[PDB]
């Protein structure tokens, strides 16, 4: 059409309060890079699947969505095949994907998802409120399981009786080293500690039954909420309403750092399970393109950009630069040279290749790096940059001058000879045949013409 | 042909003693990335232009060369036009080039060079031997010019009479803020401190004549070599044979760090001129492709790779990893969050885009980063990764089970109800109609089939 296309994306959860500002900032970059704009509309947490499934079938046009019931819907033809789009529009994004993301999201030989590259493996963890651990001196060194959590819950119940000891909710189920390959509400798992060729009922796995017994003991003791089976209310990571909770953590979280940042306090973690790449971890955050989208190519271009352009993605995820965050350091690859490094055991940087991909030696200071950036930014061009002197009309005159120059120039230019004597001598020989003046005037004329852009 | 092509590059100067090792290491990468190999043959310093000009005209086949007399030879048709090759094979390399490199190397509307991205501007500098500055306590704070160098040369001549005070050679000429737009041995310059529209004779510029007078005074005093007008011998940066020398320095050198590294000692620098982008700085290190090359496309692919692949280029320029250098730090973009950052003023990383391009917050430790790398490397795949359960034969049985599950599961899974009572109750309802067993057996059969790859 006549305007740059606007691609509409549906997202799960509630909108940021500053969504207009975030999209303005993002769209500066998206418009510049791919000649389009992104509109993100949020559908809430509660009835996401319902809103996506039924209202889409008989209703509205869309380009991109956060997927619900991906595996089922992919088989029904709800989503545009991405197999060919990944070869061109999505080529950069595809290279960043762990092969498990491809295996996990392939349906009958085609791929229909853009997965967010992140916790391709993850583990279940207890997350502890560090403010309360410090206040009461409760040691968590022995905690490796629901069963071994008990002594620590006993301590917090005694010392701080109004804090919820283990803050869980109505979707809770005990975690183990299980693969639930199908997300359908049924009790069937592969026990990764048992026979991995067998489908088993979790309620018949002895250690899982033991966990349920433990949880029920916690219920009787008031260690978990009285209304756990019915409650919606979330526990704010920032507040001191809770002592321990269960969290999914993977390599993209960098240990306890992300939780501690979001909570703005010390959050300590102890793993309950091992990490593994499975359907659940590879399918958790999938974008799809509507099979009815009128902008399939541009939709992929935007997804490619969201997953490869750090200015764009950081602006959305950290929020507005200067209000939400600021830069404190830039990426630097450093080396130190060793005794093997000598003039004869390597090539020279100046005549081998782009010096800006060379690693930075240990003796370089941050000040020297910043000075180099400032100097590159401040440097101007000579007005004679790109000037070429055509010698066609003055061939023999240049040869005459150059021959005369070569007899004097080294003696004069090194200061071997006194210039007061040698320059007048040189100038007489250059001008004795008129070649000097001919070349000088031709050079000036062509330079005049160059500066006037003729 | 039948074999991966071997691209032959001619280079100026003398070969590294370990050239075979360097090319083996490089060619591992070049072969893998572009399906070709690079052969580099060195032609020496002395007669490079002669060897390149005449022996090429009537002699041998080649693909790539370090250019000599680029501007003249480009106009004669010696070099393959790169204008179109830069649009595909060289697209990444072209994006890394300062526009001055394009302007400086364009000849009659076409570009024939791959310039090394490096000191697009540079300045002339005095470089001092820091070992001698320290030993004798000679202060260089007042040195800004050839004239103001005199007192420091007087001091070293007195204190260390056998050291060469200002180590210059037969190609020396005093430097100034001049543009020599044509490299032809002639005396014509643009004075960047004067009228930049005029071509002038350097020997008539008053301050340049003054420099020659100064240099001649240095000659009479024994501050420069007695044989400067004839000598070939270089002064080794590593040795204490010299006190000051003149060096070209630009932003790619990071101040005095590169000189100090190559010398393996403190080298101090003082600039003589300003920095500017001109023909001399943009044309200094140009690779060309022979107009007679049988591998023009692959030649550009190799040049593109040399100028964009850090593993490749660092291997050649630093030399062999573990013998010549070792890694001490990897590139990291860091931020700190500010008071604006709250749950409602940004998007979530997990469902927005590739988390590996997100900047690293200040509270993340290097240990947490390394742990994340190790965990990503160690994580395995579930044997059920990619398993899809076809429900076609068990639709009503799944619905029956799922309905029964939804009546019990929250009470059991949260531990609200005692599992000793509730699990037997649940299991009776699931099996009362035989739907449980039907779904379990179908799931196991399809899983068996999946594991056998049917
Ligand atoms: Zn367990
Ligand atoms: Zn750094
Ligand atoms: Zn004299
Ligand atoms: Zn000067
Ligand atoms: Zn770093
Ligand atoms: Zn009970």
Author numbering:
A (entry chain A), B (entry chain A): 37 to 490
Question: Please, what does the article write about this entry?
Answer:
S. pneumoniae relies entirely on carbohydrates as a source of carbon and dedicates a third of all uptake systems to carbohydrate import. In the case of type I and II ABC importers a substrate-binding protein (SBP) presents the bound substrate to the outward-facing side of the transporter, which selectively binds the ligand and transfers it to the transmembrane domains. SBPs are formed by two α/β domains connected by a hinge region, which are interdependent in the apo form.
The structure of the carbohydrate-free substrate-binding protein SP0092 at 1.61 Å resolution reveals it to belong to the newly proposed subclass G of substrate-binding proteins, with a ligand-binding pocket that is large enough to accommodate complex oligosaccharides. This closed conformation may be induced by dimer formation and could be used as a mechanism to regulate carbohydrate uptake. SP009239–491 possesses all of the features characterizing this subfamily apart from the calcium-binding site and shows approximately 24% sequence identity to the other subclass G members. This helix is positioned in the central part of the ligand-binding cavity and may play a role in substrate interaction or recognition.
